[PDB]
Design an enzyme around this catalytic site. Structure first.
Site, PDB file in Angstrom:
ATOM      1  N   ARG A   1      -5.641  51.452   5.793  1.00 28.75           N
ATOM      2  CA  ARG A   1      -5.327  52.880   5.838  1.00 28.75           C
ATOM      3  C   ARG A   1      -4.046  53.147   5.023  1.00 28.75           C
ATOM      4  NH1 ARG A   1      -3.524  55.771  10.211  1.00 28.75           N
ATOM      5  NH2 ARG A   1      -2.928  53.738  11.101  1.00 28.75           N
ATOM      6  N   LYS A   2      -3.587  52.130   4.303  1.00 25.69           N
ATOM      7  CA  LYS A   2      -2.378  52.255   3.487  1.00 25.69           C
ATOM      8  C   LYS A   2      -2.967  52.748   2.173  1.00 25.69           C
ATOM      9  CE  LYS A   2      -0.342  48.185   5.710  1.00 25.69           C
ATOM     10  NZ  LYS A   2       0.335  46.869   5.501  1.00 25.69           N
ATOM     11  N   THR A   3      -3.352  54.017   2.157  1.00 26.96           N
ATOM     12  CA  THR A   3      -3.937  54.647   0.981  1.00 26.96           C
ATOM     13  C   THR A   3      -2.888  55.655   0.492  1.00 26.96           C
ATOM     14  OG1 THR A   3      -5.085  56.148   2.451  1.00 26.96           O
ATOM     15  CG2 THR A   3      -6.373  54.391   1.438  1.00 26.96           C
TER      16      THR A   3
END
Ligand SMILES: O=P(O)(O)OC[C@H]1O[C@H](OP(=O)(O)OP(=O)(O)O)[C@H](O)[C@@H]1O
Ligand SMILES: O=P(O)(O)OC[C@H]1O[C@H](OP(=O)(O)OP(=O)(O)O)[C@H](O)[C@@H]1O
Ligand SMILES: O=P(O)(O)OC[C@H]1O[C@H](OP(=O)(O)OP(=O)(O)O)[C@H](O)[C@@H]1O
Ligand SMILES: O=P(O)(O)OC[C@H]1O[C@H](OP(=O)(O)OP(=O)(O)O)[C@H](O)[C@@H]1O
Ligand SMILES: O=P(O)(O)OC[C@H]1O[C@H](OP(=O)(O)OP(=O)(O)O)[C@H](O)[C@@H]1O
Ligand SMILES: O=P(O)(O)OC[C@H]1O[C@H](OP(=O)(O)OP(=O)(O)O)[C@H](O)[C@@H]1O
EC number: 2.4.2.19
Lengths: 267, 267, 267, 267, 267, 267
Positions: free
Chosen positions: D142-144
């Site tokens: 989710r480290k977008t």
């Protein structure tokens, strides 16, 4: 070169038009119900002498209303319904469902009237400055109508005037407050330069030949004398000129009269 | 009763203010960087004679900029920086970080200038109609600036004029196009009534005493004679009055001069 | 001067943060439900050597999550969790309901990691150019991440690099396509000037000393030699320098490594 | 099956493209003015070896710019402008008004470069894990990039990797904070289940075989061992594999190099 | 665990409330003008037997209207204004400017009435299924009111029912159309799995024990028999139960009666 | 006259449809991926007796999904899948890529079911009031579903009922709170009139023949007796009539049953 090419094929401005429409119809359009969808014809009239401005905007109003428009004049043309035969001039022929025409009407006319008004008042002053021999620029200001900045600046250009800086991210404009804050013009300019960089100009409001010089040497791009580089003077309206660089005035746009337009169906 | 109570504590209008701000700062605010955040004081000046209008709007601009404002005059007050001692009048004192003040400035002033301009021109005509003995209404039109309808109508009210119908969903306005479409005034009114219902008025543009009568009997609420119920006449400006009901004019709002305001920091 | 002052107290960027949050929670936040609202403490860690950037952005994430943050370092500071005691460095202490902390987490970290990454890679190249004696500018490009332009440009500035032109409305950039279209550099510049005016610079991509000269004399503000005024060279990365004006490179921002950050609750 | 079918014919993503365009043109497009609307041809080039990704997105950029595009390769294809004949490869031919092409350019290229970069780095690691005999999954995180989640996850899929949970409403992810809050893993899972229900999986970060077992028996769907059901391990990059279920890594997407693309008009 | 913790401290839902308010006040609030801003007190009444639901939503309506609310009951509580003493029950006391109260009113009541209605009808069926010994789940559907999905699903949870899949990106739901498209259940599942991955469940609508088995072995997570894994049956309402896993019904939410609420000022 | 003509060719309502779609697909549409884009045919079925309403809305859902729809019945038609041959009735034939059809489905059906439900319940009560000889109006209320006001009011009209006032800016509605605030009915009406003007009606909730009279003479347009001009009574449902003007009831819209619809592909 065509002015309307300044507008991106798609972008926020088209959404502005949709919002302007919603502003006129919050729930239902009763008139559209009575009038129905029979295909109709109509003429868009200019009822006062002035320059035609706002075409791409009104065109966008007409496109979203699913109409077919034929413009009889190029944007920028100087119209003179001076002929009292009618005192009017057809600048566009429209076709589409009756209701769509009537929905479009008021919005498109409100765009044209104001856009034409700014362009006209813009043309009058640049034609005036030009007629004295002045070879410089006549610019506008940031005293634009809230939410309508794109349209008004655009109208300034079509009229023959400069727009000046679009916004606060555009060309840096330093004043006493800034100079007092950093301790000096030189310091205000250094800090301004450090964040805006080479791609954006820096202007400084100076009150003396010593003010200007320091700014010039700090590297300011423009200098405003009020009360290498370019010079600017700003404060007043349609009346001081000298072979200098910039004269700014909100008279070309703010609180200017409007150019009357009307739209009526054929029969 | 306080006019600003017309605005909902929260709703779209506050978002309009945020958008007006973004319109002025698309990327960075270089000036805010040089000026910094030191707490400052400033006065908001009125530089021309006219009615003060646009307070809640400018107040909202100041709130989002996190400032503390003190208004010295009630909205609706008639200001006269007639005294040449300065030719100006402080209508509000502001406090907050220097940059916040300068960010707010241009937007708040653009709101006030125009809002005060419409209110003033509105007051002048209703004071004029009133001074003849006329006991009726002077209304505005839908020829408002796209996207700024809420503010301009609001300014009309503060000035003492009617706003007329807000939009197309507001009061039904029938004309020839509609009457031709349904075959008759009576038919146009029946269809209009069938969809708008009892809660919303129906107005009909009539061109003869026979036109009106049929509308009256169809049940139209208002009748516009151009060229139980109320009567309206519309077409011209500050100049025809008779003991009749409604006179509409876009002169109170559209293309009207502005009331000049300025804002400067203390020292 | 404080970099975060470039951001307007209010404007679109704050809405971007809200949208970034909605992007992470389209319907419910199950974790927030299990964790509850007990007040907690937490530390924000930097796990890699590099410059701290993105404070105002992450701060805005924390404000909308209703938390209390204490920053232990100024934005722009060069962090070195080089000490393997932990290999980490607390750059901020946070307090607030457990769920709010966990909601904030991923968004704030994604902002910091990338913002710090651009700033760091920016600092490395300007420190490199500077260490050779070069006295000019190192700029970025418009090859930014879609929708994240404000943040990336901002990160460029904090790192010590120029941003170059923000967008297409910013500084005019002419090329062969434009020159071919108008028939000549001189013509391309005249048309460019006619619409952008004095407040905005015009740059021309030239392929010869004759190209440049004509541009110079057309009045172009910047000249890019590839393959009064300023000169620019652009194409490559961290490796050509000479006492010239501008060197642009997307290496400072586009496809750059990230600076790792983490956030954990106390106990 | 075609990946682009994952995108809804209409929905928010198309609005994202419009916003990306507005981001590049806040007021006018001076270049579009000089270049005009003459119909032109152009080729979109790939200048580096990697997988082609981002077609539907760039296509949407081109559609809103009213252009005609012909894609020479299917999304997912592995391009190798290895041939130094040019070091480039035409992946699409475009036609439309010159200005429209130039407006589109930078946005479409910024989409492709990054989309292709994530897909490529994704393919490299799944091809690597696959080449050892591993039969499990390689997932992302989710480290977008804030605001770009749809595009990056989509790029992960085209590359051959799992996306993992999209957001916080997607698959429940429990940790110590949650377990400490409810008093036990069993309790954290019960509460998580009570709100997410049967349609959504629950994952638990366990630090011991006893941790896992309790989660397993609480009914957790996935178990992450760090430091019936599926198991996951996450922390590191392109380097530990064993016949287990899930290996997550932000290396496939976050801070990854880009695949260079360019676009030039014919003549 | 508190249900309202499912809602993110900030996110789209709060904007929905603002839009609901704007929906009620497109231009001015005449009533607010007559009523003014004097501080008032008021009670929120429940006039029918049912479960209290929608607190955080109505609370958000009250917060944006700048009021002070005191809730006398916890969300989820079963209210019985059965006592005819009044037939009403005060569930909250409110304080704030008169106009703000009246602006809030209709929106908050419209939220509560419907939210309480879904929760109530939800509680009735799960209490019914539960009273037979059934140990499984009773779920809702995607037949929710357009634009109100967040609120209705939330109301389902508070009532004691499952929500089922939130949307199309949530849990994959395969049917004949999909199976016919890929040639087989096994193929439909493989393709579904290839794009949704491990984090999201896959459900298949089967019409035979052979249908199910193939799905089971393809790896489907849920199986719907109509007309390791879980089984579902769906089609009808409050009336078939057997010791199986899922029973879905739109009767808990769609077209359900409302729980009447009212709000009146003190004196 | 065609009801759908009440909806503006373009405006906010179309954006509502797009938002309703995004609400169903926050990230990907896995089903669309498995099903693909092969052209398909499908029928939209009505499964319960009632009036067909919501055509333009569902049509807009289908247009944005790029489908071709053929409506077999006019909106307003009374459908009776009474014939048990199937118990269904095809009201529209659709064609387009399989995935587009399935994306559209749930949204369009959720619109139709509810729209048809309000229209039906509306028709039943006006047919009932009409069958007694009553010649007046049956109106709805402002107790509409948040965010869905346009659709529900529209459905009221198609059913044969009045909508009553759309919002708070629509027809002024005075009550005790207002009367107590201004000191008297006469005062409340004067203030209400001063801001709404001639174009908008004023209604007053009176509790006595003396209450009404004062309102009548203040100039109120409508009078509500509970517990020249028009009279209204409101409080109850499908059950009091007398040759009076208005009877309002939320039973026609709020918490009403739905009319079941379904959509299935051909083969
Ligand atoms: O409106 P005009 O008289 O044409 O003058 C326009 C000038 O006004 C502005 O000053 P600023 O906005 O800082 O001070 P002001 O508000 O007092 O004009 C700026 O100097 C403009 O160039
Ligand atoms: O602008 P003013 O002259 O004050 O007139 C205002 C009147 O104009 C409008 O007519 P409409 O907009 O249908 O015709 P128009 O555009 O020709 O004025 C309507 O009749 C207004 O009451
Ligand atoms: O990415 P870099 O190599 O640092 O180069 C950056 C340069 O690229 C741009 O050219 P343009 O975008 O017109 O051509 P391109 O897409 O081929 O780089 C412009 O010239 C930039 O200054
Ligand atoms: O970035 P990578 O090293 O590939 O690791 C990815 C992992 O990071 C996340 O942990 P979390 O975000 O809770 O802790 P972090 O921020 O310290 O990684 C979660 O565990 C991911 O699966
Ligand atoms: O509304 P209910 O009768 O409770 O049934 C709910 C069921 O309906 C849905 O089928 P789908 O939407 O595919 O077919 P439908 O529209 O005919 O119900 C899905 O099967 C739901 O679980
Ligand atoms: O819902 P119904 O019973 O049909 O009644 C509808 C009436 O309710 C409203 O009163 P208000 O909303 O002020 O009081 P309430 O909330 O108690 O109904 C208004 O009087 C409506 O005409």
């Amino acid at each position: 070169p065509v002015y309307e090419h300044l507008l991106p094929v798609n972008g926020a401005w088209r959404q502005d038009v949709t919002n302007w429409l919603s502003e006129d119809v919050p729930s239902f359009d009763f008139g559209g119900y009575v009038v129905g969808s029979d295909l109709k014809e109509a003429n868009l009239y200019c009822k006062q002498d002035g320059m035609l401005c706002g075409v791409p905007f009104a065109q966008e109003v007409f496109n979203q209303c699913e109409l077919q428009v034929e413009w009889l004049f190029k944007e920028g043309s100087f119209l003179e319904p001076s002929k009292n035969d009618s005192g009017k001039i057809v600048v566009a022929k429209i076709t589409g469902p009756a209701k769509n025409i009537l929905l479009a009407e008021r919005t498109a006319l409100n765009i044209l009237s104001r856009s034409s008004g700014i362009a006209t008042a813009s043309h009058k002053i640049i034609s005036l400055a030009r007629s004295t021999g002045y070879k410089g620029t006549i610019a506008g200001t940031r005293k634009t109508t809230p939410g309508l900045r794109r349209l008004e600046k655009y109208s300034m250009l079509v009229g023959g005037c400069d727009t000046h800086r679009y916004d606060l991210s555009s060309m840096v404009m330093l004043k006493d407050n800034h100079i007092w804050a950093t301790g000096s013009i030189t310091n205000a300019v250094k800090n301004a330069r450090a964040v805006c960089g080479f791609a954006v100009k820096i202007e400084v409001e100076c009150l003396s030949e010593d003010e200007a010089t320091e700014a010039i040497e700090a590297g300011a791009d423009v200098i405003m004398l009020d009360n290498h580089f370019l010079l600017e003077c700003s404060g007043g309206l349609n009346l001081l000129c000298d072979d200098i660089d910039i004269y700014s005035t909100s008279s070309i746009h703010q609180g200017t009269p409007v150019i009357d337009f009307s739209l009526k169906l054929a029969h």
